[PDB]
């Protein structure tokens, strides 16, 4: 690594353990994202919406792995856990579920640049606050908007919710 | 000065106050539009509407500081008073309120108009005429009319109300 | 709230009064802007120059309250007061207050990016050094460059620079 | 009524009996139209002036309902009064018919004005003004015209009149 | 009346008093449509549903004048009675108000289509089969699948019908 | 007594008639403070366009008079335009200063039509000024103003400078 | 129903006897157009022009029952009968087969009207009259054309009428 410059090993390893945090929370969101296809559930609209979540999930944690080769760190993968449950209820509880995933994935964030902010790493206090972390910032507040509306209509309020919100913003947000 | 002529100073010192009016009109109007941001209510077809409707308000003093400077007269600006409330509940007393504010504000105009009116200034009395007061009546009847829709969908009804007229009429009615 | 994480009190009542800074400046400028386009002076470049300054305070202070809102916070509005003057006198002193009235701009947003950097808000200090400080420091140097060349030519001088700095940048610029 | 606001009945009761007065106009005119498309006359042009005119004094009276719901108030439908003949002769008294219509019609316009500029209602000022009282002075003259013509072609020139006056501008009127 | 063939005073008395059937229809229509977009009742889509009925009527009206002239008949035209009421309740009524008025209407078409079909006129079969019959057969169907949907939601389902059908496919049919 | 006449007196009538001319004398003066700076003993091209234009406004002005009049009946005579008020307007800054006068005056008769229509309940006066007339003139006395209060403070090196970077620059894209 | 007005059930019960004549017609008219596309015979023209004439059928008779729902009629499906033959031999028979099978067609549709029009249903004389009687007149006549060519070629000359007549039309008669 004729390259490593000011890239300590103690942050080294953190990405390394947030790589696969990205990796575990795309899981639970294709989980959470094909059990709303299913019959049972029928709702279109969330499993396109946590579909998609899992898209961006699966495409930050490839973000982590080229920050890291470009820094010089050679990262290491371990398993990915299972997600953390195996049916998800209603979509009330499954945002819920998302939204506590969102809160620990954006807190175990935080800590890196807390933690590269003490190993006085700039070039992590850029790429993390340029690309992760006014996304992660971004994405709670969806969710806690997707929230706030589940609850005014709770399953009638459950099934218009999909089609005059997530499916036509999910249509016009890409 | 120089170009000043049929402008009185009575009529010059109201419309310094209507001024004022229109931007704490518009001071109510984006709290009122960021409070329905907020994840605790995420209603975000409301809060477009009242932050597109500040905008308003903040164009037309505006444009009262145009019409001034061109009648020669001179305007001073006091402090704009803080809103009404801090937070506005749900949204069917927030358009209550907001239905009261508009009725004070063409009520200033009408005031406005017969000071001039009677003081026999014309180019006021068919300047508000053309700018003000048929934008404040349509104004009205458009808050009524989402009034009327309030109630009867009256928080189920709440929800649907912004989707299915609100953001479709924001969208359509850019 | 339930997106509110890793987002202080002590940091979320200074947005609130940095919001308020920025709608005064806005009114500074405002006045500061609609006196130069009155008869008596009749500078039309710097009337612009000055309304769209203000047009971009305003801007900002809203986007002060999109970046609360989403971060968690809940903010209030204080009554905005009165601009500094009312008679802004000569273009020389009202560069000379508007850069005063910058700087101390600057400075407020400063002050926020160092309790943020002490209270280790990295979502904040990406949001301010992206958005604002950079826009800031931008501003004083042109406000800066006006005011040296505002000298140089000191009212002949008066009128060609509104003429051939102003007018000419303010259509081209924008 | 919560929109109501300077609204009175004195004058609520008139635009009533004037939408009732445009729909009778209308009336006279679409009647006096089909007279003149009758084979026993076989005046085309002439015909199609008067179906030209009833359609505009249908949009008339619909503009007064459109500004009575704006206003608040609350309209109703008198019986339209068949028109005040059955066999209009011939142009030069249908003009002249036609014409007396018009007059009337100006008359309760410049009454309903006289009522609210003493009530002091600056909307039904503007509102008359722009859209009705300047679209009446330019008709009346538009019938003076025509009576003009025909008292100097006065049946050949009766034929010539609506073949080379009423037939030309009426297609460049189309 | 050169042209006059084949067209009987008995039928040619019935037109005239069909032509103020459909004269009084299009009244009452006007006068539906216009209560529905009152701020009492704020419903744009039935107002504009029954506004654009309105003139459907009054272009069926003024076909029975054109077939008429064209047939050699001389029309007369009394005078057009009030709407039914004066303040229609809600929807539901007011469609069924309709849709009562509707079929009279092409109950007298029925008839007048017996009449001359014993009378043994073929160009009246002609011209009321194309133009006449199929329209009200398709307008009754039209009314009664409002009416079914509207007892189906039924005033939150008054809202949701105007919103999702009458808005709809109002503008896509136009 | 003509067919069209309705709610049109004389009193206004024969006021509109005087108001006409004064239009004429006005496009009469500007005409002829125009072509004064084309003369080069002045050569300032900037204000003789201007005060050209001008004239032109209100040519268009006092043609909007007379359509008024026959449409609203009444019938018009014209007294003969006497002369400018000067031969000579000296420099800009009292031909600004004599033309700011000369709209002032101007703008004063169109608010006293329309004080006398107003108490005669004139409607369409109302309607036909306010938005033809009165508007206009609040906003060509502004700009006359803007410019005397420019050409003050520049203030003959200056009087060149205010034609080139002011009028002249604004006189093409204004236009 | 409620849109029900001037339709008998005496009229209601022979449509839906028609709308099952159409159906069996077209599935005559789809077995006689496959077993001409079978090896055995290998006539594509005759084939095409048989399938294409059963998508006609189908779509009267799915333009009866748009036209019975649209009548208030409910409409019952009795069984379809299998059609009169299952070997349909020479072109030559067939298309004899197929104008006896149109010809009762026609004739079932002549009683049809035959029976409105003696009860007095002037909207089923049009509907028969323009969609579905002129349609048989000309479809009886292009199946004697061809009858009448098929006897002169008349298995060579069956051959090339399919090639040169069926076929040529068929492409440019889609
Ligand atoms: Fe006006
Ligand atoms: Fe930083
Ligand atoms: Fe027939
Ligand atoms: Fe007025």
Not at 116 to 134: I, K, M, N, V, W
Request: proline share 1%; with cysteine.
């Amino acid at each position: 690594s004729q390259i490593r410059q000011n890239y300590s090993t103690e942050v080294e390893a953190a990405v390394n353990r947030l790589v696969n945090l990205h990796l575990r929370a795309s899981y639970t969101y294709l989980s959470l994202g094909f059990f709303f296809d299913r019959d049972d559930v029928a709702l279109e609209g969330v499993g396109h919406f946590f579909r998609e979540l899992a898209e961006e999930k699966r495409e930050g944690a490839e973000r982590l792995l080229e920050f890291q080769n470009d820094r010089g760190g050679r990262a290491l993968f371990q398993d990915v856990q299972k997600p953390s449950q195996d049916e998800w209820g209603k979509t009330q509880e499954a945002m819920e579920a998302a939204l506590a995933m969102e809160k620990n994935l954006n807190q175990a964030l935080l800590d890196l640049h807390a933690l590269g902010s003490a190993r006085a790493d700039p070039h992590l206090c850029d790429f993390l606050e340029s690309h992760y972390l006014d996304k992660e910032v971004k994405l709670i507040k969806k969710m806690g908007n997707h929230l706030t509306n589940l609850r005014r209509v709770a399953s009638l309020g459950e099934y218009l919710f999909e089609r005059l919100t997530l499916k036509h913003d999910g249509d016009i947000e890409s």
